[PDB]
Amino acid sequence: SGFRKMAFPSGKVEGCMVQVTCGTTTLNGLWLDDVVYCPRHVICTSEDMFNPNYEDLLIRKSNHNFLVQAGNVQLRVIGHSMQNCVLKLKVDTANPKTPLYKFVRIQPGQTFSVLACYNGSPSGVYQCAMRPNFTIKGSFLNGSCGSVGFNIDYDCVSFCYMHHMVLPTGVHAGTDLEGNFYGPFVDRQTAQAAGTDTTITVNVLAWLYAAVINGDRWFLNRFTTTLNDFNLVAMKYNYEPLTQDHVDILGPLSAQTGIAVLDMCASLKELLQNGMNGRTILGSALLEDEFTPFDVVRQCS
């Protein structure tokens, strides 16, 4: 028994976090080999943020206007460029703590860990999901901008996220490590509203599989259903449609539990139409959608 939202161990990323200052603005950067990555709005004043012309603003910056601090060591900047919405600062020292790594752009619904940092210093780690509307429900006060999200496979860190903005709703928007935003958001202080935040159906089903593996079976019901009939119900409840790809990703969990995916869909259906009547699943009074099928296999096999 025992199922926890778990984040990845953060040590490999802790060794890459640095502080980046340009003028009076400071935020977090990511130091890998001899490049530091950070949000380009590090070059903006609070007044620039309303309508930045990043090209024009960057023209007025030289290598020596970028202060990069790694602990107490200060790094010498020998070059700078803009890639989409990320600033790349070339430094004269390769990070000795650079882990094996790749830059990946994740899909909505996939999960990752964020190492929340302030002024280059790691403060906390938590697990979250890329919401279907490409927002992240983070924990970030002023100063965590530039914090990164990642997954770890064996000894390789896949960086998938860099926090750039807090929207007026308080939710977060960011980019991949090539500087391309997830979703329609931009690095400007302007009206930016996110679409409907739907529930990640394939993740909810994975979590129901984890509940069964852990002894929570009360919601296991006696009906089955069809993919079209289920999506009919899912659409009404602002759940993402389930595809056959999702059914196939759930394959290993159906095999471990002997519960067919459509049977699980019919129990989910009943839960969406009836509620939980005051009972809990895995200690939660709502359906949880920040576990992917792989996360469940990771923690339940």
Add this chain to the structure above:
Amino acid sequence: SGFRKMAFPSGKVEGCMVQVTCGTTTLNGLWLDDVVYCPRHVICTSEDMFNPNYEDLLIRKSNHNFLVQAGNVQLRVIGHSMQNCVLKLKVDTANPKTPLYKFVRIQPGQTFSVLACYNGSPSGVYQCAMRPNFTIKGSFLNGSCGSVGFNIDYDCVSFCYMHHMVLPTGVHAGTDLEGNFYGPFVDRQTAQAAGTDTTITVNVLAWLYAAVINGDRWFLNRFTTTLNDFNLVAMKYNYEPLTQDHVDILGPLSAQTGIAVLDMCASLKELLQNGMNGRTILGSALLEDEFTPFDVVRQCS
């Protein structure tokens, strides 16, 4: 906005995790300076666990019967002793990655991060609370025994927990780093049932303060109450009694929000007697008790 259960960055502890084998039993150990700490039941066979005589079982073990592996480096054991329920293995090398650290014994209700490990390898990090019945609702399959729980203050790791057992209920029991169990549990495969798992009232109140800080105010009601009158209600709902010490620990949150502790207690009361009628607080459909007052200050000031 934004409030997440956050764990501490784990890197300082990742550098201390090792694998400890005695005969055919392997588990996680903690390498600090030139001592490795691990559950003494590493010396037990599956059959020894029903009624171990640890003194007699340890007599039959020499330094060379303890295999300690740190990554691919194997450490030379030059001594061994038993301290309560923890085995201490003296090795000939001080861990170069030893962080500043202390051993502390925490109170029920306090929180800490667990770095779940398997065979010496970090696999995940999560935040939890010492339950008032001295259990931990962990995520630990066979092999995570010896995983440790910790808090970090600046650059100092306070180790407070070592996972030793899974009880028949699936919940976890462990020791502090001096080898003394939290609660009445013992390192033996026998009937062991935990007491009532009450809710940590002072933590629930801290979390309600975090909700107010984050804009969730619907539960803020118009009543007040008294400490005796509140504990009357808390006892009925298997909530821990609130003391004046708890009121004083909540002092900074009452000051930040302008909401008197007894006012918050009266809103909690109303929630315990009425439920939440289907609405949520900070995205949760139940009251959350794994945030201490300090955790909330950490993430909300």
